[PDB]
Amino acid sequence: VSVLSAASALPGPTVDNATLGRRLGTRTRHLAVDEIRHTLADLAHQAGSRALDAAGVTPEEVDLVVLGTATPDRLMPTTATVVADRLGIDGVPAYQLQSGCSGAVQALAVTRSLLLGGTARTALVLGGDVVARFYYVLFGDGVGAAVLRVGEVAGAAALRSVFTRLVGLGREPGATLEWFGPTEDRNRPAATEDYKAIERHVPDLAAEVVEELLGELGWARDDLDYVLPPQLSGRMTALIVERLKLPQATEVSCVAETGNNGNGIVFLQLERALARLAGGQRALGVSIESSKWIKSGFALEG
Amino acid sequence: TVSVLSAASALPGPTVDNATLGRRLGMDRLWEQWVDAFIGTRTRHLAVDLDSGEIRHTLADLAHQAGSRALDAAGVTPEEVDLVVLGTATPDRLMPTTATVVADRLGIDGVPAYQLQSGCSGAVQALAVTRSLLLGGTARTALVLGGDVVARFYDLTADLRKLPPAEFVNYVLFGDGVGAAVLRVGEVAGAAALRSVFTRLVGLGREPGATLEWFGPTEDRNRPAATEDYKAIERHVPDLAAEVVEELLGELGWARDDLDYVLPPQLSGRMTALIVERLKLPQATEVSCVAETGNNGNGIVFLQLERALARLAGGQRALGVSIESSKWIKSGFALEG
């Protein structure tokens, strides 16, 4: 399976820390509020269009849509079906996964599976989040997308491996995010995080993903060109890269400019990696979801 | 091939009949007779205690029960499960997912755990995704779950006594519940082979048939939380269901006369009859539950699987069909004993 393109859609202008401090290691972010001006669906439509244009694929050529989010516009209809309609994609399966930040890698894993097994040949994969209903310096809003096709396509990036794995048994959640019904009491934390557990466990789990990807591929550590690490903040990113022991690999990060946009991150990384990945160059991507300790990763070869 | 080893369900609390529900809501006998005429759903299960309106069951509680039941029924331990996939419209929280929470409760760990968000066709989506992952990789055994709990969207303590019955007809249609199934790669003697399964969005340019909102912690909740187009559902669901039957029968080479069971969409007692009429499968025995359980969304397919698996003998054939009106998704699957 090849990755033909990846693109992103970020709402509005960059909002630096000065500006955010006034209105009230991550320097800027994009927000979907100026009033809410961009919905998940609007951004997924933009990202999907950009990805399809970059790949030279028309909407009619799409055989499958898979979208990962923690924050869909509504519970139903899904964002996946709504964005497929906006794009002119129809008569195809359209799946939506619910998760935190590894939902992007889950979407890539599901899609890889369905392309290799199936009648589908070309897929549009999306991931993103808009957390405007929950709002401060860590987060951002954003969606990204990628076009995948069966085969090795010259000039593209081969998706050499992908996996996800829950390693949460008996562990308390590391993050929570609630939704409310139309009449119930809402005076409780809508979102929670265990920073102590995240700081200790994310870098260890990121290292285990790297060791697994490398060992299954038979790839050597010093032969890796790029690493696309977890993107929680500038500080956490620096801490994880030191733990990964990939001194030869160039880091592909965005959180310091974009904020943590959850399921969008992997796609923004893919876009930035594909803008650098030459023929034969190798890349690892790692996504660790703290909600219930999901480790995930993938491997690309130019 | 992938085989369905077992299926099981978990329905919260007591069976709640229409007269009990009427007493609660302050309705009269004429109202009960209208429900019988137009709806035909006789009983349902609710995740709330009817008298107090207090929530007694969560989606995760129910999924734990249903999953435990399905694993026992298949003779599979939690440590032997290699994949979990859950379909719902109503997860307990946005994160963590119900899939991961229920995996914890069951003792399942070290596996991919996927959660699909959809209306009623999420169950068949979960079957499709699971089939592909079992066939494509090292995983051999999967637990697949689907269900819904809509207690956040109803209030049995509200004053409905003056309203036209059409205005609160949802109260007689829905039910809360979860089901589960255990799937294994390959042909398994005494199991049911999942011979085909598919899902397909056909809603391009069409208005949603149903909508369901969720709210943030501070936002104004004035907008309608749920909408439905009951006329559009009546117009399209029977025809879309017939189209799914036609496609399944053609792709397998099965004749209508040799079909043993049909598991049709479960929207209400009277709608089921209309749909079965449109399917034109006079030799097939219907496997329905909606008149007893209410429409529990993603749970429906698994409740039907539980019932059909108790009846499906070697060589016997069944088709399931799920049509999701949210954005017009058709889906179905074929079983052979």
From TrEMBL, chain A:
Keywords: Acyltransferase, Transferase. Pfam families: ACP_syn_III, ACP_syn_III_C. The keyword Lipid metabolism does not apply. GO terms for biological process: fatty acid biosynthetic process; secondary metabolite biosynthetic process. InterPro entries: ACP_syn_III_C, ACP_syn_III_N, Thiolase-like. It comes from the Bacteria. One of its GO terms (molecular function) is 3-oxoacyl-[acyl-carrier-protein] synthase activity. This is 3-oxoacyl-ACP synthase III. The lineage of its organism: Bacteria, Bacillati, Actinomycetota, Actinomycetes, Micromonosporales. The gene is abyA1.
